[PDB]
Amino acid sequence: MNTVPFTSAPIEVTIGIDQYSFNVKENQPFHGIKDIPIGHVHVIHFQHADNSSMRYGYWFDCRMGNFYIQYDPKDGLYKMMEERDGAKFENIVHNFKERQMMVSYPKIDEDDTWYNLTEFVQMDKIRKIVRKDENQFSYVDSSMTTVQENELSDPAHSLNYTVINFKSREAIRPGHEMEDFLDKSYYLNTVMLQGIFKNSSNYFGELQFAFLNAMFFGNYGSSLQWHAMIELICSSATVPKHMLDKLDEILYYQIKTLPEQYSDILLNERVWNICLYSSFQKNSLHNTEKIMENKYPELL
Amino acid sequence: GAMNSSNYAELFNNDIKLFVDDTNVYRVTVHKTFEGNVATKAINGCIFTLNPKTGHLFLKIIHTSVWAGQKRLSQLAKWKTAEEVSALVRSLPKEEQPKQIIVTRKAMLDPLEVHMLDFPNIAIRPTELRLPFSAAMSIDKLSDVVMKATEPQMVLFNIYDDWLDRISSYTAFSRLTLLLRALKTNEESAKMILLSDPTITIKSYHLWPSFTDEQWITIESQMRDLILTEYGRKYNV
Ligand SMILES: COCCCNc1cc(Cl)ncn1
Ligand SMILES: COCCCNc1cc(Cl)ncn1
């Protein structure tokens, strides 16, 4: 179990760690988060009390280094940093826990929610999507645009997600225009799976990463990416059976975790009705359809 | 974006453009079978592709053989239309290719956009105008070439005959849409108006009769009356 210590908490802030969150008051005796499960990526995220604008945060994996949070009064944000001096990292942390000023990652032992939301996400792959190579952790915020949004403006600060565009020459084989547009199997299986992603594991990892950025930061381009990746599968007549079964589980846990009061802005009515009720896979997502109909029957 | 009454004169500027109407591509007669069920029999159809500035009509005849063994023919018809329009554009010299294609039905947008991905600079647009091009098969010479076709065929017509020698393309288009609106509202009456007088003939290389300027004014007035008439007969006004 790993620890993300804090220098101090000079400004009042709501702190998120994965699907959990808590409030820290200005200058409150707070030394960070302990007992973080090893083996999963994690996200630590922030919303300042005085400006709920800009949710922001950091994806990290404690196996990839010793990380601490330090408030920068010039840039006005809580920054993740790496302590290379392991000895010194170990030296600074022990005092805080004898002194008890850390919040404990509060995992219920029955609870596989975070595993189920991050099963295919890889921290080294996240660095490929969020380009800032000098750090082992990746910063994301509410305002960051995707490469596809920048084609329709700073490149260094963008979310490099796999570009998906159903009316593109990549998606449509010459001479199969109707076929490829009405059944996207070629685009899913040959172009995307075999060609770009390499396997479905990678496809699920980006799809899961896109959802979590939409949910935790209200990142609109990430929401667009999540829905496009769902729709590409649902609009394919030929999908490996194990991919459909896994997608059903992935979406079930995403819909289950979604805050009830954010469903209006995080769920695209057209895509979900099409996917559940008109698409090739309309009968293939039993768990997702059941939770959707019982939790958000308005959207449908 | 969409074409409507506010940007109507754009049709007659010097940017090449084509209307595409797919109404008459997939045509059927519905009939009873010996067992008393209903079946369809396809008949030949046509794509109506029109340059509104020059009157050039690219009439692609759709022979019933293109439907043989195919499913969901109403959906296929939109994609076949888009395929044939794309083929037409590719067949034209670059300087003759359209800068915009205006489809008369919104269901043609995605099929045509997909077939024209190779042409990112050609704008594919809908329209809010209710154009009466479905009535093209009420023009006898167009109907004849469609129904006589034994194979796929493209035939080029000028739908304005020689009118542009005497009137502008705005006025020619207005005349054409009035004629076609009348033929759509009451085909028999419209055709009686157009042919009642046997001393005015249709030249072999024309579609419509050789009306003088003064005769066109009379004809045009009679078509307006017909349309207003039928509108009363229809709504009892
Ligand atoms: C400016 O901080 C001096 C020590 C930097 N390394 C750290 C900081 C913290 Cl909170 N925990 C562990 N290592
Ligand atoms: C442009 O993205 C192509 C690679 C995406 N594969 C991933 C992404 C994530 Cl977060 N986790 C695992 N695999």
UniProtKB/Swiss-Prot annotation, chain A:
Q: What is the effect of changing S236 to D/E?
A: Disrupts interaction with PRP8
Coiled-coil portions: none
Which residues does the annotated region (Leucine-zipper) include? 244-265
Q: Cytoplasm: present as a keyword of the record?
A: yes
Where are the Phosphoserine modifications? S236
Q: How is it modified after translation?
A: Phosphorylated on serine and tyrosine residues.
Q: Which key words tag this protein in UniProt?
A: Cytoplasm, mRNA processing, mRNA splicing, Nucleus, Phosphoprotein
Compartments, as annotated in UniProt: Cytoplasm; Nucleus
User: What does the miscellaneous comment read?
Assistant: Present with 7330 molecules/cell in log phase SD medium.
Name of the protein in its database record: A1 cistron-splicing factor AAR2
As recorded in Swiss-Prot or TrEMBL, the protein's gene is named AAR2
Swiss-Prot record, chain B:
Q: What is the effect of changing D22A?
A: Reduced growth at 30 degrees Celsius. Strongly reduced growth at 16 degrees Celsius. Strongly reduced growth at 35 degrees Celsius
Residue ranges of the TM segments: none
Q: What is the effect of changing T23A?
A: Reduced growth at 30 degrees Celsius. Strongly reduced growth at 16 degrees Celsius
Q: Which cellular compartments is it found in?
A: Nucleus
Q: Where is this region: RNase H homology domain?
A: 7-237
Q: Which domain of life is it from?
A: Eukaryota
What the entry says about domains is: The MPN (JAB/Mov34) domain has structural similarity with deubiquitinating enzymes, but lacks the residues that would bind the catalytic metal ion.
Give additional notes from the record.
Present with 468 molecules/cell in log phase SD medium.
Q: What does this protein do?
A: Functions as a scaffold that mediates the ordered assembly of spliceosomal proteins and snRNAs. Required for association of BRR2 with the spliceosomal U5 snRNP, and the subsequent assembly of the U4/U6-U5 tri-snRNP complex. Functions as a scaffold that positions spliceosomal U2, U5 and U6 snRNAs at splice sites on pre-mRNA substrates, so that splicing can occur. Interacts with both the 5' and the 3' splice site, as well as the branch region. Has a role in branch site-3' splice site selection. Associates with the branch site-3' splice 3'-exon region. Also has a role in cell cycle.
Q: How does it assemble?
A: Component of the U4/U6-U5 tri-snRNP complex composed of the U4, U6 and U5 snRNAs and at least PRP3, PRP4, PRP6, PRP8, PRP18, PRP31, PRP38, SNU13, SNU23, SNU66, SNU114, SPP381, SMB1, SMD1, SMD2, SMD3, SMX2, SMX3, LSM2, LSM3, LSM4, LSM5, LSM6, LSM7, LSM8, BRR2 and DIB1.
| UniProt protein name | Pre-mRNA-splicing factor 8
Source organism per entry reads Saccharomyces cerevisiae (strain ATCC 204508 / S288c) (Baker's yeast)
Lineage in the entry? Answer: Eukaryota, Fungi, Dikarya, Ascomycota, Saccharomycotina
